[PDB]
């Protein structure tokens, strides 16, 4: 299996989020047991405040380096849906905490800069 990568259309970034429905103890443990040094910022939150329904995983991780969607799947796995994050450090940190339940708290408050 050979694949070609470059800078066409979508490009790699230092910010990627992950979301999976009805997360298992194994999957949640894997991501929660991930290398903190690998991501300057790591924030995971659990969302499950509805009886009769299963829990859901929702968190954000800032890649210390530049990685692509397909590549990032090497850690976040294909099982869990990943997407590009947007906003400031508080926007991402608060967004994950919006669930009211924290699954993992590590890394530093990575914010954007441009002005």
Automatic annotation (TrEMBL):
Gene Ontology biological process terms in this record: DNA replication
Entry's Gene Ontology cellular component terms: host cell nucleus
Location of the protein in the cell: Host nucleus
Q: Where is the CRESS-DNA virus Rep endonuclease domain?
A: 10-109
Has UniProt tagged this entry with the keyword Cytoplasm? Answer: no
Q: Where are the transmembrane segments?
A: none
- GO: which molecular function terms? ATP binding; DNA binding; endonuclease activity; hydrolase activity; metal ion binding; nucleotidyltransferase activity; RNA binding; RNA helicase activity
Keyword Membrane found: no
Q: Which UniProt keywords apply?
A: ATP-binding, Covalent protein-DNA linkage, DNA replication, DNA-binding, Endonuclease, Helicase, Host nucleus, Hydrolase, Metal-binding, Multifunctional enzyme, Nuclease, Nucleotide-binding, Nucleotidyltransferase, Transferase
* Highest taxon above the source species: Viruses
- Subunit-structure text: Interacts with the capsid protein; this interaction relocates Rep into the nucleus.
Q: What is this protein called?
A: Replication-associated protein
Upper taxonomic lineage: Viruses, Monodnaviria, Shotokuvirae, Cressdnaviricota, Arfiviricetes
Of the intact sequence, the residues represented are 2 to 116 of 314
